[PDB]
Ligand binder design. Sequence first.
Ligand SMILES: Cc1cc2nc3c(=O)[nH]c(=O)nc-3n(C[C@H](O)[C@H](O)[C@H](O)COP(=O)(O)OP(=O)(O)OC[C@H]3O[C@@H](n4cnc5c(N)ncnc54)[C@H](O)[C@@H]3O)c2cc1C
Ligand SMILES: Cc1cc2nc3c(=O)[nH]c(=O)nc-3n(C[C@H](O)[C@H](O)[C@H](O)COP(=O)(O)OP(=O)(O)OC[C@H]3O[C@@H](n4cnc5c(N)ncnc54)[C@H](O)[C@@H]3O)c2cc1C
Ligand SMILES: CN1CCC[C@H]1c1cccnc1
Ligand SMILES: CN1CCC[C@H]1c1cccnc1
Lengths: 440, 432
Amino acid sequence: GFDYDVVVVGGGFAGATAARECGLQGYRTLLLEARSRLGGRTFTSRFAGQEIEFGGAWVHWLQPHVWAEMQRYGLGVVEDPLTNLDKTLIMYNDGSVESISPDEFGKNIRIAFEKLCHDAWEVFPRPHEPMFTERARELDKSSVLDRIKTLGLSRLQQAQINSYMALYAGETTDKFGLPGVLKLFACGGWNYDAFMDTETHYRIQGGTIGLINAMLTDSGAEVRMSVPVTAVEQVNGGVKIKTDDDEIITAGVVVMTVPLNTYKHIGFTPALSKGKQRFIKEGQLSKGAKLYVHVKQNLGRVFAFADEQQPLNWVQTHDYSDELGTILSITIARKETIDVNDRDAVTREVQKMFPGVEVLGTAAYDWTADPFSLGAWAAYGVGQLSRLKDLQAAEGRILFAGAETSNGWHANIDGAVESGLRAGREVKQLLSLEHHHHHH
Amino acid sequence: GFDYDVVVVGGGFAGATAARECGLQGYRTLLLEARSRLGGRTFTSRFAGQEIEFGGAWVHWLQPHVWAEMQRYGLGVVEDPLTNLDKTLIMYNDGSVESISPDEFGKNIRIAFEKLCHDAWEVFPRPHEPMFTERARELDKSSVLDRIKTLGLSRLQQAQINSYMALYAGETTDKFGLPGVLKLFACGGWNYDAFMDTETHYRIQGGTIGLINAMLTDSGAEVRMSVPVTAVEQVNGGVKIKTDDDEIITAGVVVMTVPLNTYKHIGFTPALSKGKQRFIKEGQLSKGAKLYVHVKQNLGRVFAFADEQQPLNWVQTHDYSDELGTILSITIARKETIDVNDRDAVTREVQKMFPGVEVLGTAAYDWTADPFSLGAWAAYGVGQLSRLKDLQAAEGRILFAGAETSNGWHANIDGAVESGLRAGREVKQLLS
Ligand SMILES: Cc1cc2nc3c(=O)[nH]c(=O)nc-3n(C[C@H](O)[C@H](O)[C@H](O)COP(=O)(O)OP(=O)(O)OC[C@H]3O[C@@H](n4cnc5c(N)ncnc54)[C@H](O)[C@@H]3O)c2cc1C
Ligand SMILES: Cc1cc2nc3c(=O)[nH]c(=O)nc-3n(C[C@H](O)[C@H](O)[C@H](O)COP(=O)(O)OP(=O)(O)OC[C@H]3O[C@@H](n4cnc5c(N)ncnc54)[C@H](O)[C@@H]3O)c2cc1C
Ligand SMILES: CN1CCC[C@H]1c1cccnc1
Ligand SMILES: CN1CCC[C@H]1c1cccnc1
C-alpha cells in the first residue's frame, strides 16, 4: 500500500532509462530530480545564438544502448567539424604552443594511443565483462602514467596522450587507473580510429534533452523537480524516501541514479555495505568543467591539446563562419587550473593558445561546484575498477544505477543508459509476481 | 471496431521486437506465425545431445540493437572455440585441401579482407545511412568479384576472401553487391579484427529462442502459431488480414516482417508500389543452408574455408573432447552444391576436407526448401542497396520490417531487431 511502485532518484540518462522501463511495465513510477532541470550531467543550453551542450554531448553507433534508444525514438546524429581540420595545436606544460600539420598530428596521436593500448585485445576480450581476464584485475594496480613512462614516446606524442588521458581522468595522469582506459578502447572495437570517432564527433539530434524528454514522456511516469532526496530508509516490503523538506514518500523499490560523488548527501538506513561505503568515501576522480568561447575571427576547423598543467585541455571547433566568427568547444580536465569566472583570465588563456583573437563571449559550466554532480564524467582511480560490482550490488529494495555503475561506456551517456536498463530489469525482478529471479 | 490495434506478421526477431514495442505501448497486439515454431530464420534445436542453432546464432556488443536487448533481458554470451585454433584449412575450387599455419591463415585472410574494404572509411563514414556518400551510390554498380579482381591477391588470399564473400552472398561472388559488404565492414568499426569478432564468435546464452521468448513474453501480445497469412487488404482506418483457412482479422495497422523471398505468397490489395514489387520479383541472393557433423575423433579447434564451387564453405568447431569427439558447425553458401539429406554424400564431402574421419551423425537445415524462408540471410545483389528505401517505405497502414529492410547489420539478427524498433516507432506514429 505504498505511494508508488518504484521511485527513481535522478533525472539523468540512467534515471530516465530506468523510469521508461518501469513505466512501460505498468508500474506506478515516480521520478525525483534535485535540480530544477532534467539531464543531470547533460545540459542543453544556448550560447552565441546557438544550441550548446554543457555536459555530455557526443554519442556513436558503436555505443549499443544509447544508439538503440536513438533508433527507438527516431533520433539520428548531428556531425561536428572534426574532419578536414585546418589547424591542430599542442600546448605543453610550460605553456608553449606548437602548430603541427593535422596529418602528422593524427599519426602521432594514433601511434601514442595505440602503444598505450597495445594489450587491449588480450586484457579485455569482453569489454562488457571488465574483470573477465586475470591480467586486467592485475593491471588495476597501475596508473596511466605508469604505462606512459614505459611507452617511450616522442615529446609531442607524450604531450598528446597525456592531454587525452588527463582530460579523461579529470585529474593528473598519476591518479588515473589504466584498466578503465584499456576497457573503453576495447569498447570502441580495439581500434583508435573508431574509438576516436565515438567520443567527440556526433551529437544527438534535437539535443540530449530531446532524448531525455522522449524517454520520460514515453514512460508516463510522474516527474518532480527541485525535490532533493536526503535520506532513504528500508522498511519491510518497501522503502521510505525523505526529501529536504522532510516529506515522506513510500515506495516498493527505489532506484538510486545520483552521481557517486554526491552520495554523501543521502543517509541510508540501514547503512550500505562496506564496499559501497568505501566507494562513496573515495568518490571518483574527475574535476572537469566545460567552456564555450565565441571569437570574432573565423578560425575554421581547429583542434588543440593542452597538457595537464594548462586549462584548455581539449579544444575543438563547434561552429565557424565569417559572419559568426568561431564558437569553440573547450573541455577542462581540472577546474582548479582556470577561473572560468574571470573572463579576462579565460581570454588571456585563449589568446595564449590563439594569439590576437578578440573574444566576443564564453559560457562555462563548473561541474565541480554543482552540489548535485560534484565532479564531471566517471573516472576510475587506481584499483577502483576491480571493486566495481560492490557499487552495482542491490541492497534490499534499493537499486543502484548511473554511468559509474556500468560495465561498458562508463565515462559516457551509453553507460548511464545501460545502467538504467539493468535497473529496470532488477525492478522487474523485485516486483515480479510468479517467477522470482535474483541471481547476483 | 477492429479486432486488434496492431497485427505483426512473422515471429522472427523483427516481429518479436515490433510486438514488444507495440505491446508495452498498450496497443492490443496480435502476432501471426506461419510455422509451428518461433524464431524465423533463427532456430534453436538439439543435436548430439547439445543445443545448436540451425539459423542465426552469433551476436556481438558492436551490434547495438541486439546487444541492448540482451542488456535489457539479462542475457550473457557463450564463446565458441574460435581463438587459439588447432587447424586452419583452405579448399580450392578444384577440391584440393591445403593446411595452413593458423597464424599465416589469419593474416592472409586479414590482408585479403582489408584490401577488399580499403575505402570502407570514405564510402561509409555513417554505416547506418548507407546512401550518405555518392561513391556508395556508384559503387553499387559493382560486384564483390569486380573488386577482388582488382585487388591482385595471392592464390590463397583470393581463395579465402572469395569463400568468405561467397558465403555472405549465399551465391557466387559475381552476383554479390559490393556496397553491402563495405557497409557491414563499416558497421564493425572499419577494422577486420573487430568485424570478424562480431560474426561467428559469441552466441546468446539460453539460445536465440530465449531472447525471442523474452521479448514476446514481455510484450503481453497474443501469439498464434501455424497460421500463415495469405492476403492483406486495406480499408479505411484499418487492414483486413486473411489466413490460409480464410478467416479475416481486422486491425488498425499491420507490420509485415516476413522474408523478402516469401512475399510471393501474400496478395496485397491494393498492390504494393512498383519499387516494392520489383524488389519482391528480384528477391535476395542467399541460397545457404546449415549443417552440423558429429565425428568420433577430436579434431580440436578447426576452421576451414572452401571456395564457391565446393560445398563446405564455412567450417568451425562447435564443441570437442576425447569422449565427445568433434561437433562441426558448417555453413553452406549454396544448398545446390550438396545433398544434405543423404548422410553418405555429406560423409564423403566431410571426409574430403578431413581425411579418414569416422562420422557419427549429421543434422541439417535447408533454408531454401522452407516455403517461409526460401533463402537464408539477407544478401543484396548488384544495385539493390541503392533502392533500399523502396523496401522500407510504409504503404498506407501496412508497415514493413525485417533484416532486409534495415540500414545497419542487414545480414544479422541485429538488423531484424533494428527494423522491429523502427516498425514500433511507425506504429506509434499511426495510432496516436
Ligand atoms: C562536461 C562533460 C562532458 C562529457 N561528455 C560526454 C560525451 O561527450 N558523451 C558521453 O556519452 N558522455 C559524456 N560525459 C559523461 C556523461 O554525460 C555522464 O556519463 C552521464 O550523463 C551520466 O548520467 P547519469 O544518469 O548516470 O548521471 P547524472 O546525469 O549526473 O544524473 C544524476 C541525477 O541525479 C540528481 N541528483 C543528485 N543528487 C540528488 C538527490 N540527493 N536527490 C535527487 N536527485 C539528485 C542530479 O541532478 C542528476 O539529475 C560528459 C560529462 C560531462 C559533465
Ligand atoms: C543459416 C543461417 C545463418 C545465419 N547466421 C547469423 C548469425 O550467425 N548472426 C546473425 O545475427 N544473423 C545470422 N543470420 C541471419 C538472420 O538470422 C536473420 O537476419 C534474422 O533472423 C532475420 O529475422 P527476420 O525477423 O527479419 O526474419 P525471419 O527470421 O525470417 O522471420 C520472418 C517470419 O515470418 C514468417 N512468415 C513468412 N511468410 C509468412 C506468411 N505468409 N504468414 C505468416 N508468417 C510468415 C516466417 O515463418 C518467419 O517466422 C543467419 C541466418 C541463417 C538462416
Ligand atoms: C566523452 N568523453 C568521455 C569522457 C570525457 C568526454 C570528453 C572527451 C573529450 C572532450 N570532452 C569531453
Ligand atoms: C552472420 N553472418 C552473416 C551472414 C552469414 C552469416 C554467417 C557467417 C559465417 C558463417 N555462417 C554464417
